[PDB]
């Protein structure tokens, strides 16, 4: 093991679209659901893959309030998206928070979350940790 500085540990976010997973909003909405009784969690990562399709989603009840959470000041838009799908919806019979059925994470600007927020552009992805020093980093990055 060659680990000399703490900032040699990278946390990369790879999207599901690079895993040949169908990413149209038609068949990407069946990996998502509502559930009560689970707290949301966030985890910091460092860098990530440039995304192919991203999503911007706000859903509401028939009384007029959003079913997703209010985003904190930490949450920002995803940096690079080739295509952003704007979906406005309404879901009567559904209480709780939004969760992912595959166990994947909703990627934002250096924050991976288990829930979806309001008015923020995310993607679907998973993170991985590795140890890279500078001499090997300059060899692969280009």
């Amino acid at each position: 093991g060659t680990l000399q500085k703490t900032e040699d540990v990278h946390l990369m976010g790879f999207t599901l679209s690079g895993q040949k997973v169908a990413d149209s909003p038609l068949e990407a909405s069946k990996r998502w659901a509502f559930r009560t009784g689970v707290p949301p969690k966030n985890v910091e990562y460092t860098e990530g893959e440039e995304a192919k399709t991203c999503y911007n989603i706000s859903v509401t009840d028939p009384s007029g309030k959003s079913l997703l959470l209010d985003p904190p000041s930490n949450i920002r838009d995803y940096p690079k998206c080739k295509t952003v799908h704007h979906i406005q919806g309404q879901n009567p019979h559904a209480q709780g928070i939004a969760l992912h059925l595959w166990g994947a994470f909703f990627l934002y600007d250096r924050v991976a979350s288990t829930t979806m927020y309001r008015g923020k552009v995310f993607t679907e992805g998973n993170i991985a940790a590795m140890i890279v020093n500078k001499t090997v980093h300059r060899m692969i990055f280009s």
Partner: nanobody, 136 residues
Framework: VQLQESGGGLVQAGGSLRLSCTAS????????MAWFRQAPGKEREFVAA?????????????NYADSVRARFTISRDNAENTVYLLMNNLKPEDTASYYC?????????????????????????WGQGTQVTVSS
């Protein structure tokens, strides 16, 4: 097919109303339905629209005009065969005659992302409308 509107009236600025749209001889579970408004001396403009499939997640896909976002909400109840619009925080620029409409041209396939149903040449079966007046 035959639609009617109800629930309009005169309110002050910042008030709220709820309009109902019912069908007598038509089951609304085959149509995508929308609310419009028209001012005297102005053209008939889009307000809101709601789709026809359910999708479990993102249940009914809706769309709103930019002047009425975060204030108006549209909804439907299939068993009661009714489409509601709840309007909150009214301005005197919202004073108009409101109309209910349906289409069968769209509402196929599934989830309609982005500005959809914003036109008026495909909507038919307009009701007589109701007058919403916001003034001090």
């Amino acid at each position: 097919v035959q639609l009617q509107e109800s629930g309009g009236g005169l309110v002050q600025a910042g008030g709220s109303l709820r309009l109902s749209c019912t069908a007598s001889r038509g089951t609304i579970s085959l149509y995508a339905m929308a609310w419009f408004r028209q001012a005297p001396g102005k053209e008939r403009e889009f307000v809101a629209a709601i789709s026809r499939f359910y999708n479990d997640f993102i249940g009914y896909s809706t769309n709103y005009a930019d002047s009425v976002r975060a204030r108006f909400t549209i909804s439907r109840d299939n068993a009661e065969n009714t489409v509601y619009l709840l309007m909150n925080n009214l301005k005197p620029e919202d004073t108009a005659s409101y109309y209910c409409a349906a289409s069968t041209e769209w509402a196929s396939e599934s989830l309609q992302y982005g500005n959809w149903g914003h036109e008026s040449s495909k909507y038919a079966n307009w009701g007589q409308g109701t007058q919403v007046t916001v003034s001090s």
